[PDB]
Amino acid sequence: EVNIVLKADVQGSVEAISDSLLKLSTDEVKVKIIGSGVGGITETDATLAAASNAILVGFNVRADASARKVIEAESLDLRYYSVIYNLIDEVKAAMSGMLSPELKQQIIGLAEVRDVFKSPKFGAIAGCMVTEGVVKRHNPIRVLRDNVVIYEGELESLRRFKDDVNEVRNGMECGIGVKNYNDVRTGDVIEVFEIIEIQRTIA
RNA sequence: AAUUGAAGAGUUUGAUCAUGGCUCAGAUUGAACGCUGGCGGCAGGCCUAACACAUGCAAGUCGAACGGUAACAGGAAGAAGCUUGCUUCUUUGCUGACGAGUGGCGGACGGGUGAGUAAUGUCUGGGAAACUGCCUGAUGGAGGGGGAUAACUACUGGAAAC
RNA sequence: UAGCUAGUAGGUGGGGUAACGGCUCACCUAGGCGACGAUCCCUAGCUGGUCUGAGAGGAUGACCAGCCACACUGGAACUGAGACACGGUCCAGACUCCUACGGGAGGCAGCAGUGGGGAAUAUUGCACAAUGGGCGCAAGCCUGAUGCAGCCAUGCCGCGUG
RNA sequence: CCCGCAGAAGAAGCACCGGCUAACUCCGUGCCAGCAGCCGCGGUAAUACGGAGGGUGCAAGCGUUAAUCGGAAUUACUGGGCGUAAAGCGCACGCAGGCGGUUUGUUAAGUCAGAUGUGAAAUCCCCGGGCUCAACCUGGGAACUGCAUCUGAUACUGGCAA
RNA sequence: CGGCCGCAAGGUUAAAACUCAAAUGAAUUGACGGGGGCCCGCACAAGCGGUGGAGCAUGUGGUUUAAUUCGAUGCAACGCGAAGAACCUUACCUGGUCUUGACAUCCACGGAAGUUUUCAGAGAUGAGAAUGUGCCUUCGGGAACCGUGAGACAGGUGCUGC
RNA sequence: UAGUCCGGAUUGGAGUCUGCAACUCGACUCCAUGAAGUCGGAAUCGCUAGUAAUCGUGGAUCAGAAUGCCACGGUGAAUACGUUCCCGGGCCUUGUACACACCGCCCGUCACACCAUGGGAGUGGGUUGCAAAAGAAGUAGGUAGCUUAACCUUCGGGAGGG
RNA sequence: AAACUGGUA
RNA sequence: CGCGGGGUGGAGCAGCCUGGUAGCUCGUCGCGCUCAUAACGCGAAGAUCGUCGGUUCAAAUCCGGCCCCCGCAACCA
RNA sequence: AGGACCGAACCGACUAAUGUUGAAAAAUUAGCGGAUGACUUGUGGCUGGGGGUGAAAGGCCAAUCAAACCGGGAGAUAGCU
RNA sequence: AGCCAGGAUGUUGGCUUAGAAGCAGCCAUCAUUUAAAGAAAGCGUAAUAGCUCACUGGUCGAGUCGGCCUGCGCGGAAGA
RNA sequence: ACACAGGUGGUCAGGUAGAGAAUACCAAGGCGCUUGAGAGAACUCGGGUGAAGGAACUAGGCAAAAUGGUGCCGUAACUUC
RNA sequence: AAUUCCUUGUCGGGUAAGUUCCGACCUGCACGAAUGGCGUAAUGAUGGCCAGGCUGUCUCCACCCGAGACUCAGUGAAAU
RNA sequence: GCUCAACGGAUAAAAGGUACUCCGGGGAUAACAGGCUGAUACCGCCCAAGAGUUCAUAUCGACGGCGGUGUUUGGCACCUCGAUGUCGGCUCAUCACAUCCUGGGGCUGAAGUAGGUCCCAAGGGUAUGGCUGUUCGCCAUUUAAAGUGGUACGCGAGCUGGGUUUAGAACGUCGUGAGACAGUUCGGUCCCUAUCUGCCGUGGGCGCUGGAGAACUGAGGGGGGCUGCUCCUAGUACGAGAGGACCGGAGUGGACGCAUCACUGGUGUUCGGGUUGUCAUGCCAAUGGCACUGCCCGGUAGCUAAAUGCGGAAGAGAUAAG
Ligand SMILES: [Mg+2]
Ligand SMILES: [Mg+2]
Ligand SMILES: [Mg+2]
Ligand SMILES: [Mg+2]
Ligand SMILES: [Mg+2]
Ligand SMILES: [Mg+2]
Ligand SMILES: [Mg+2]
Ligand SMILES: [Mg+2]
Ligand SMILES: [Mg+2]
Ligand SMILES: [Mg+2]
Ligand SMILES: [Mg+2]
Ligand SMILES: [Mg+2]
Ligand SMILES: [Mg+2]
Ligand SMILES: [Mg+2]
Ligand SMILES: [Mg+2]
Ligand SMILES: [Mg+2]
Ligand SMILES: [Mg+2]
Ligand SMILES: [Mg+2]
Ligand SMILES: [Mg+2]
Ligand SMILES: [Mg+2]
Ligand SMILES: [Mg+2]
Ligand SMILES: [Mg+2]
Ligand SMILES: [Mg+2]
Ligand SMILES: [Mg+2]
Ligand SMILES: [Mg+2]
Ligand SMILES: [Mg+2]
Ligand SMILES: [Mg+2]
Ligand SMILES: [Mg+2]
Ligand SMILES: [Mg+2]
Ligand SMILES: [Mg+2]
Ligand SMILES: [Mg+2]
Ligand SMILES: [Mg+2]
Ligand SMILES: [Mg+2]
Ligand SMILES: [Mg+2]
Ligand SMILES: [Mg+2]
Ligand SMILES: [Mg+2]
Ligand SMILES: [Mg+2]
Ligand SMILES: [Mg+2]
Ligand SMILES: [Mg+2]
Ligand SMILES: [Mg+2]
Ligand SMILES: [Mg+2]
Ligand SMILES: [Mg+2]
Ligand SMILES: [Mg+2]
Ligand SMILES: [Mg+2]
Ligand SMILES: [Mg+2]
Ligand SMILES: [Mg+2]
Ligand SMILES: [Mg+2]
Ligand SMILES: [Mg+2]
Ligand SMILES: [Mg+2]
Ligand SMILES: [Mg+2]
Ligand SMILES: [Mg+2]
Ligand SMILES: [Mg+2]
Ligand SMILES: [Mg+2]
Ligand SMILES: [Mg+2]
Ligand SMILES: [Mg+2]
Ligand SMILES: [Mg+2]
Ligand SMILES: [Mg+2]
Ligand SMILES: [Mg+2]
Ligand SMILES: [Mg+2]
Ligand SMILES: [Mg+2]
Ligand SMILES: [Mg+2]
Ligand SMILES: [Mg+2]
Ligand SMILES: [Mg+2]
Ligand SMILES: [Mg+2]
Ligand SMILES: [Mg+2]
Ligand SMILES: [Mg+2]
Ligand SMILES: [Mg+2]
Ligand SMILES: [Mg+2]
Ligand SMILES: [Mg+2]
Ligand SMILES: [Mg+2]
Ligand SMILES: [Mg+2]
Ligand SMILES: [Mg+2]
Ligand SMILES: [Mg+2]
Ligand SMILES: [Mg+2]
Ligand SMILES: [Mg+2]
Ligand SMILES: [Mg+2]
Ligand SMILES: [Mg+2]
Ligand SMILES: [Mg+2]
Ligand SMILES: [Mg+2]
Ligand SMILES: [Mg+2]
Ligand SMILES: [Mg+2]
Ligand SMILES: [Mg+2]
Ligand SMILES: [Mg+2]
Ligand SMILES: [Mg+2]
Ligand SMILES: [Mg+2]
Ligand SMILES: [Mg+2]
Ligand SMILES: [Mg+2]
Ligand SMILES: [Mg+2]
Ligand SMILES: [Mg+2]
Ligand SMILES: [Mg+2]
Ligand SMILES: [Mg+2]
Ligand SMILES: [Mg+2]
Ligand SMILES: [Mg+2]
Ligand SMILES: [Mg+2]
Ligand SMILES: [Mg+2]
Ligand SMILES: [Mg+2]
Ligand SMILES: [Mg+2]
Ligand SMILES: [Mg+2]
Ligand SMILES: [Mg+2]
């Protein structure tokens, strides 16, 4: 929800801008005008915009001293425009910004378990051979045993022989330590991936 | 004539008496809100932001203090196209008056507010070392001179204010 | 909140005010206030009165009347009998407005009225006919004081809805 | 303010009904929905919730909320308490402070008596008068319980002397 | 929290927000006590015979079933209601039937009651043939009883033993 | 002196009998088979005299049904020293924070939710003490600079003002 | 010798 | 190829110089005790001695193989 | 009074620059610490090497110290260059 | 292979359609009329239309089309 | 090792200013340091000044710059007072 | 944390931006009580961080004063 | 009679530390750098299921395949152990193009503006800070852009010394201990006068055919080449609107470079003045020396930046992609 507190100089302007803003309401995100009025921005308008995280917009009006008191004390998003199209552009920008970042995954590593070992803190650690890609320190992982998901989490411990490492490229041996992954069995595959964003926008 | 003045109840316990709190019945208000609403008389009406203000009005008056004709309500002279003796038009302060100016009185009253002030203010009761426009009583003067300035004219700076 | 005060308390002389006075200076003394509450901190205009109560007391100071303080904020003085002056002056400050960008103006806590705040509180009205003030010999002019009217069941009282 | 025409025509609502507290039945619901100042009602026969009928109270008003006093002798001066309900310091010595045996004299401070002055008006109260009654307005009185000065009393308290 | 005191532990002075309708003292009656005293019962002790072990009868719980009808549940339910479930009893299950009805009562019409057999069908049940057509009888009918029809009704071993 | 001439369940075959009806689901009889069971754990029950123990007979319900219920008789014991205790009950007294009356009441940590509150490195404001800098306007004091219509003058200038 | 506890209204 | 002890029922356990009916603690299913629960008591199911080969009426106790666990060595991923 | 304070002589050596075939085999310039004390200094004496001394750094013992210097075993040995 | 012509619609198939008869989209995945035509491959038209592909008629006229095996070349080919 | 910017104990110690044996200029006294003369370039060393900005420099305010005396007034948290 | 690998752990403060610093959290790889634990006024040519002043440290160097460097005369090295 | 099992059997009889170290050797053997290689990494290409509403190839692209570079992580041990100084920073650079900006084009799922992808192009240009030793990285805030790599991971006989491999000390951890950690923490000597090559400047000799003084031509070489914003065209083309051009002109900036002191300033120990202490010129007065030019205030010329003038071009020829 995008909350708007709209005050304009003329009632015709108020009633035109309200419907112009309502027309562009998308299913994913909507816009509500909690307050709509004619005249300068008042302390009541400031309080109403403080209650809900609203954008306090004045079409051809300016805040008085009393309203500016609350505006200074609590920092709200006060906006002054002179063109309905500028106001609509800003509202569309806010609506688009409110959207989700579109989390997506892609495989960047692959290892096969061999020669299970033991550890005091993490319990049973897996001695993996990286077959393709790269495996990083703290990235989400998926354990597959015969192409069926067994474990979902994040790679916690990654060292070689004796030294902790941040990454291991394909072709080297590595040790993977996940305390909750206690059913370590030879032949298991581990997929490593990261998270990518596309940052959708309304259109 | 002016002193005709004083009520209790519910609630702790199985029940009782105490102690002790809470609650209610009364009166009152610069009240607000809900439902409803015919008339009249008297009174009251920003208690919060001593927060900010568009616009109009709320302190003027004296020509019987004095220079004056900027309005113009009269009159007279004169010059004139003449209604043919009655009109008109420039001077003229004689004039009923009077914009602007000097001068006198008033603007310290009336009106508004409760910020500040814990006594440097207020209430009560006293005092001595004081002034007092206008209003009133009494006793006495009110003689003779001088130099300026506003207004008004001639220039000049100004968008305005000046 | 237990200690507070150096012009501080007293005296001589000068100065100053309408008037007494550390009111102000020079000098001399070390004094003065405080447990009967000094100093410090919080709150608040005071009274006649109003409410309540049998009374004593408790709460309160809205209207009317008396006194005090203030006039956008801070400061100063002039004029005047009387001001350290609500609709005066000068300086400084915050804010607002006009500008030809050279430069200027402003003070509703006066009566109406507007924005804002709030649960909440009215007409941008008529007249100087009466009373009372300012000027004037008077006539007369001015007077949002005042007299009236408009809005509100806000209160008290009276009548009707047969 | 008086007169004339017509016509019951234009004019009644709010709260409450278990006890406190004046006023009872039915239906719906079934610890749900709801009520509630206090005690507290509602878990299938509710005088306590919702509706209807009936009744009680007030009336151009009625009810709710806010605030003060009263009831509250529940800050007890009038007018309370501390063995066990709250409440005697663990005990003692002692400054300031409070109180103090008996005889006389004196003072006259406390105390009491009389007089004078004062205690604004309005408001409160008593007797009257005017708005068609009332509210309201208004004449006189009383009160304004206080404060100051003067003149006296000397029982008691205080001071001085013995 | 602040102040003072103490090496420390801590001591002394001493609140507010918030929450409840109570908290509390003395005493009365009852109950209870791993308090005391006295007394009684096949209560214990001293004995006999048992149950709990095995087979069987019966009831109950549980389970299953179309139904396994409904009750009764520590002592004080469990050979209990039940002093007699193969039909009935018997409500419960599945099927087949009826709607003023199996039973009471009001009304109309028709028909003696009853005794004999036959078709279909598990039966109930429908569907025929028979036989019979008597007492009172005011000669339009009643009383004993049968069939059909309408409406008031009849009916419930359905729930609440709080 | 044994799983037996004890023990009788189960089971097969064959029969008697009530009743419309013995298969779900009756009683009795004849032949055959002959399980478990050789005195029974924790625990628990009745009985003090014709009692217990054991042995037969009858009745109700009922067409047909008992090891159940009710009822009659034959044979016929052991042990009770005593109230020290389990259970229950009665009376007197005592303690109680109990009164849905000990199957009462009631405490604290810990897990969850909400409300207010203390400490807290810091952050943002208001007021104010002390020590300094700062000096608009105004008032007062002092003035070799400039300027000046009222008074004086020797007419050159003085006094005084700005 | 030991001898706990008792949902709410 | 790495230093010792082991392996009894669902879990933990007794039989060692003593090779003779598989027993005891805790768990599961019952019964009793109590108004009821806990506690407590009485009972039942439950087994190649970790797994095989020599020895032997016999079974880790006399031995020899296989498998598993643990004291450390067990690297350390 | 003080293993008190500031600060010269005096005793040190924290920073920087220079120098690094130096003026010097550790110094110069500018700063810096202590400066009545566990202080500093002159003269003389004692402790001798698997030993001494050490408010401890494996520090010092004549420009040399995880075992001083001089002479000898000695032409030690060197699977090494 | 060019050029001169046909090269269409039985039938807006149902439907959509700015104005869709093959071409902006679905079902339909068939067949006559026919020298010759697929209810159609596409530019194009505010859909047809205009203009085109397959097939065939005429003019022109002798070569033309696509595979296989082979020799030598071309691109793929950026570094201090 | 040098006619070496180093080290070396004691005694005397004047004037002006100054607390002073610090520091500055002088007296008595002693010295100009055993290669010079020119020029007035990069670069190095030792110094002075610097518009506006003022740590942005750097591992780091290194180095520089800055403060600096006597008298009087005044002075916080904390504290073993 | 003079102790924490993961690690620039998370939150708050400071900045404009803070792997450093200060205050907390506790998941203490791998604190801990005379190999002392936790505090602590004063002290320190001790380690870390911040602020005022100050500045050629720096943006970005410029000019000037002396000693060398350069030229002339005398003497006259060194590593390799 | 020996698990002399290290099994041709050094003793009957035997473990460690050295960062306090020392000697003799080795590039017969590692760490830095070079060399070979190219598994890995980076870049390119082949096929095309599929995504893209329809549509493989606007943009991506599964399962698979083929190459280039020398460029990361690796392999080898060929050079250097009678010495090739190692990370980061400063100063100074130079090359490649697989192009970050600027320039020219094709395609687009390119209406305009703004974008995506590919081709040609190396002339010029290509950030300051906060934190960390930090190259990198995150963050703040700019720019037209804040390019990727080679050069002994360019550059210590140019500088630094923060990290890191000496000696001191401590924490955690391991060890009985000496001690150790590729864990942390505080402190800790950076030498060289340039012979040759090279480079930046400046001279002498001879030659060029009689000698000498001048002015030239120009084979050849070097320097330079960057770019923002505002206005007009024009609120026009394009679009429903919002918004908003190509092409072509003008003006004013940033960085960089050259020149020059007319101006604004710095310096100006060679000019004038003020002033503290002290000494001297016989003394007063007036002067001089010393104390950083004693301290300080101004300031001529010259040199200078912060000051003010100019520059990068237009044009022509032959071309790359097209
Ligand atoms: Mg007027
Ligand atoms: Mg006039
Ligand atoms: Mg007044
Ligand atoms: Mg005097
Ligand atoms: Mg006085
Ligand atoms: Mg009372
Ligand atoms: Mg009061
Ligand atoms: Mg005056
Ligand atoms: Mg006035
Ligand atoms: Mg006004
Ligand atoms: Mg007003
Ligand atoms: Mg409002
Ligand atoms: Mg009334
Ligand atoms: Mg009643
Ligand atoms: Mg009901
Ligand atoms: Mg009272
Ligand atoms: Mg009391
Ligand atoms: Mg006592
Ligand atoms: Mg006493
Ligand atoms: Mg007495
Ligand atoms: Mg008296
Ligand atoms: Mg009357
Ligand atoms: Mg009266
Ligand atoms: Mg009065
Ligand atoms: Mg007396
Ligand atoms: Mg305290
Ligand atoms: Mg008996
Ligand atoms: Mg017994
Ligand atoms: Mg039995
Ligand atoms: Mg029932
Ligand atoms: Mg039953
Ligand atoms: Mg039941
Ligand atoms: Mg039946
Ligand atoms: Mg009952
Ligand atoms: Mg038999
Ligand atoms: Mg037997
Ligand atoms: Mg029978
Ligand atoms: Mg009895
Ligand atoms: Mg209990
Ligand atoms: Mg707090
Ligand atoms: Mg002044
Ligand atoms: Mg419990
Ligand atoms: Mg000392
Ligand atoms: Mg010192
Ligand atoms: Mg040192
Ligand atoms: Mg020195
Ligand atoms: Mg010291
Ligand atoms: Mg050591
Ligand atoms: Mg030595
Ligand atoms: Mg030795
Ligand atoms: Mg020998
Ligand atoms: Mg030899
Ligand atoms: Mg050898
Ligand atoms: Mg080829
Ligand atoms: Mg010499
Ligand atoms: Mg010497
Ligand atoms: Mg000496
Ligand atoms: Mg020089
Ligand atoms: Mg220099
Ligand atoms: Mg300097
Ligand atoms: Mg100078
Ligand atoms: Mg500067
Ligand atoms: Mg400056
Ligand atoms: Mg500064
Ligand atoms: Mg930097
Ligand atoms: Mg320094
Ligand atoms: Mg300095
Ligand atoms: Mg770390
Ligand atoms: Mg900083
Ligand atoms: Mg910290
Ligand atoms: Mg430790
Ligand atoms: Mg210990
Ligand atoms: Mg030389
Ligand atoms: Mg020479
Ligand atoms: Mg030589
Ligand atoms: Mg061998
Ligand atoms: Mg060490
Ligand atoms: Mg060696
Ligand atoms: Mg080699
Ligand atoms: Mg190498
Ligand atoms: Mg390599
Ligand atoms: Mg080899
Ligand atoms: Mg090499
Ligand atoms: Mg060599
Ligand atoms: Mg290219
Ligand atoms: Mg060119
Ligand atoms: Mg390098
Ligand atoms: Mg490089
Ligand atoms: Mg080099
Ligand atoms: Mg380097
Ligand atoms: Mg270092
Ligand atoms: Mg070039
Ligand atoms: Mg010049
Ligand atoms: Mg100058
Ligand atoms: Mg000079
Ligand atoms: Mg002199
Ligand atoms: Mg001299
Ligand atoms: Mg000298
Ligand atoms: Mg060109």
PDB file of N, CA and C in Angstrom, chain A residues 9-28:
ATOM      1  N   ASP A   9      -5.061  23.439  -3.920  1.00  0.00           N
ATOM      2  CA  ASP A   9      -5.638  24.771  -3.788  1.00  0.00           C
ATOM      3  C   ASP A   9      -7.121  24.801  -4.138  1.00  0.00           C
ATOM      4  N   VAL A  10      -7.571  23.935  -5.046  1.00  0.00           N
ATOM      5  CA  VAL A  10      -8.940  23.970  -5.545  1.00  0.00           C
ATOM      6  C   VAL A  10      -9.558  22.582  -5.442  1.00  0.00           C
ATOM      7  N   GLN A  11     -10.859  22.561  -5.138  1.00  0.00           N
ATOM      8  CA  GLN A  11     -11.568  21.296  -4.976  1.00  0.00           C
ATOM      9  C   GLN A  11     -11.594  20.505  -6.278  1.00  0.00           C
ATOM     10  N   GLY A  12     -11.730  21.193  -7.413  1.00  0.00           N
ATOM     11  CA  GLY A  12     -11.624  20.507  -8.689  1.00  0.00           C
ATOM     12  C   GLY A  12     -10.282  19.823  -8.861  1.00  0.00           C
ATOM     13  N   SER A  13      -9.202  20.504  -8.475  1.00  0.00           N
ATOM     14  CA  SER A  13      -7.885  19.880  -8.523  1.00  0.00           C
ATOM     15  C   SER A  13      -7.829  18.657  -7.618  1.00  0.00           C
ATOM     16  N   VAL A  14      -8.384  18.767  -6.408  1.00  0.00           N
ATOM     17  CA  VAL A  14      -8.374  17.634  -5.484  1.00  0.00           C
ATOM     18  C   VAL A  14      -9.082  16.438  -6.107  1.00  0.00           C
ATOM     19  N   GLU A  15     -10.299  16.658  -6.609  1.00  0.00           N
ATOM     20  CA  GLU A  15     -11.114  15.556  -7.102  1.00  0.00           C
ATOM     21  C   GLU A  15     -10.594  15.000  -8.420  1.00  0.00           C
ATOM     22  N   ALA A  16      -9.853  15.793  -9.196  1.00  0.00           N
ATOM     23  CA  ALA A  16      -9.230  15.261 -10.400  1.00  0.00           C
ATOM     24  C   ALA A  16      -7.998  14.430 -10.060  1.00  0.00           C
ATOM     25  N   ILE A  17      -7.141  14.948  -9.176  1.00  0.00           N
ATOM     26  CA  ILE A  17      -5.899  14.256  -8.849  1.00  0.00           C
ATOM     27  C   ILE A  17      -6.191  12.947  -8.127  1.00  0.00           C
ATOM     28  N   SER A  18      -7.219  12.930  -7.275  1.00  0.00           N
ATOM     29  CA  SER A  18      -7.542  11.703  -6.552  1.00  0.00           C
ATOM     30  C   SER A  18      -7.856  10.564  -7.518  1.00  0.00           C
ATOM     31  N   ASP A  19      -8.759  10.808  -8.472  1.00  0.00           N
ATOM     32  CA  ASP A  19      -9.109   9.765  -9.427  1.00  0.00           C
ATOM     33  C   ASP A  19      -7.952   9.456 -10.367  1.00  0.00           C
ATOM     34  N   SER A  20      -7.167  10.468 -10.748  1.00  0.00           N
ATOM     35  CA  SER A  20      -6.010  10.205 -11.596  1.00  0.00           C
ATOM     36  C   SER A  20      -5.026   9.269 -10.909  1.00  0.00           C
ATOM     37  N   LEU A  21      -4.874   9.398  -9.589  1.00  0.00           N
ATOM     38  CA  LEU A  21      -3.994   8.498  -8.857  1.00  0.00           C
ATOM     39  C   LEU A  21      -4.622   7.119  -8.701  1.00  0.00           C
ATOM     40  N   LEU A  22      -5.932   7.063  -8.442  1.00  0.00           N
ATOM     41  CA  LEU A  22      -6.592   5.769  -8.286  1.00  0.00           C
ATOM     42  C   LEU A  22      -6.536   4.959  -9.577  1.00  0.00           C
ATOM     43  N   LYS A  23      -6.574   5.633 -10.730  1.00  0.00           N
ATOM     44  CA  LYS A  23      -6.618   4.916 -12.002  1.00  0.00           C
ATOM     45  C   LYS A  23      -5.398   4.024 -12.206  1.00  0.00           C
ATOM     46  N   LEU A  24      -4.253   4.386 -11.628  1.00  0.00           N
ATOM     47  CA  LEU A  24      -3.004   3.668 -11.861  1.00  0.00           C
ATOM     48  C   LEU A  24      -2.689   2.661 -10.760  1.00  0.00           C
ATOM     49  N   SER A  25      -3.702   2.170 -10.053  1.00  0.00           N
ATOM     50  CA  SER A  25      -3.487   1.193  -8.993  1.00  0.00           C
ATOM     51  C   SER A  25      -3.307  -0.191  -9.606  1.00  0.00           C
ATOM     52  N   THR A  26      -2.174  -0.825  -9.322  1.00  0.00           N
ATOM     53  CA  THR A  26      -1.882  -2.158  -9.829  1.00  0.00           C
ATOM     54  C   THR A  26      -2.317  -3.219  -8.824  1.00  0.00           C
ATOM     55  N   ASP A  27      -2.518  -4.437  -9.330  1.00  0.00           N
ATOM     56  CA  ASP A  27      -2.930  -5.533  -8.459  1.00  0.00           C
ATOM     57  C   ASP A  27      -1.867  -5.827  -7.408  1.00  0.00           C
ATOM     58  N   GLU A  28      -0.591  -5.792  -7.800  1.00  0.00           N
ATOM     59  CA  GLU A  28       0.481  -6.113  -6.864  1.00  0.00           C
ATOM     60  C   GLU A  28       0.579  -5.073  -5.751  1.00  0.00           C
TER      61      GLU A  28
END
